[PDB]
Amino acid sequence: ANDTVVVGSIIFTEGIIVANMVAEMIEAHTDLKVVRKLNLGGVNVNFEAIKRGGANNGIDIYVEYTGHGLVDILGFPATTDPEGAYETVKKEYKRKWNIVWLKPLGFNNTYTLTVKDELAKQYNLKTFSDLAKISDKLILGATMFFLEGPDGYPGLQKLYNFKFKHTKSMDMGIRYTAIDNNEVQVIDAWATDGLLVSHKLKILEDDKAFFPPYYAAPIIRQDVLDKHPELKDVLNKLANQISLEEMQKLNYKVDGEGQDPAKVAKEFLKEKGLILQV
Ligand SMILES: CC(=O)OCC[N+](C)(C)C
């Protein structure tokens, strides 16, 4: 039959690694072949693509974050525990879109606000509220995802009354260079970022609990499951197989050591026995 499915990803390190793992798992454990589609734009492009589906110049599968689905359903930022966010997006995406959330991969790749350790020491910063009190002295460098998202800086700024001198929209790797050079003093470090535990930075505490959980999980069209039911158990073989620490190390293999994400993804799966060597 030569059936194929389309796995989509935004172009960023973690997204392409986990999309590749999904692709490798499908090709290793089923007869299906996988088109890897890369999307440019924000955290909405994959959602609109999966509504279209692989037969309609969209995608069939991608790895989504629970908190993004939660804020999209609610229309307002909220906080809840991981199960609250996961069960809510799973039930709602099935009802409204016939999209199936599979099990979480294991890590929570949340937004953070992060400063240099020395700045945190110079002002005894521990929390977002501590930072807000001195924010009028500081420049924020952040990803376009953070600056444009409803769950990002817009709602965060209003809750804490952040007063940064200005914000600079920056590519993901650039923002680490920028804080290192003191071009900015705060960045939206993401919890799994490969360069994070490598730059002498302090992650501050979200003391008012603005952000939702951001647990990554594969999601798939129901009609693709209807045609290839084996995909559910195959993709759920990834369930809880990637801790925060594991994801950070894979991200660093790409961003810090220059390895290509296809090789990084496949070697991880082989090392953990999730695929066998052919
Ligand atoms: C681009 C993207 O989807 O990144 C997911 C991580 N997060 C929640 C910090 C934005």
Q: What long-range pairs does 196-201 form, CB within 8 A, spacing at least 24?
A: 196/114, 196/248, 197/248, 198/252, 198/256, 200/116, 200/117, 200/118, 201/114, 201/115, 201/116, 201/117
Alpha helix locations (H) across 111-210?
Answer: 117-123, 128-134, 144-148, 153-160, 172-180
Distance in angstroms (rounded) separating the CA atoms of residues 147 and 139? 13
Alpha helix locations (H) across the chain?
Answer: 13-29, 45-52, 66-74, 82-97, 117-123, 128-134, 144-148, 153-160, 172-180, 222-227, 231-235, 244-255, 261-271
Distance in angstroms (rounded) separating the CA atoms of residues 212 and 226? 31
Q: Which of 11, 16, 68, 72 to mutate to test the pocket of ligand 1 (most atoms within 8 A of CB)?
A: 68
Kind of pairing, strands 201-203 and 114-116?
A: antiparallel
Residue 154 DSSP SS3? helix
* Overall resolution, Å: 1.6
- Domain extents for the chain? 1-109+214-278, 110-213
Method: X-ray
Give me 241's structure tokens. Answer: 């197989």
Q: Which of 151, 190, 210 to mutate to test the pocket of ligand 1 (most atoms within 8 A of CB)?
A: 190
Measured in whole angstroms, the distance separating CA 152 from the mean position of its chain's CA atoms is: 13
Say which residues have a Cβ less than 8 Å from residue 99's Cβ, sequence separation at least 6.
50, 51, 93, 219, 220, 221, 222
Conformation bin of residue 265: beta by default, left when phi > 0, alpha when psi is -120 to 50: alpha
Question: From residue 207, how far is each of 79, 120, 123, 160, 204 by CA, in Å?
Answer: 12, 16, 17, 10, 9
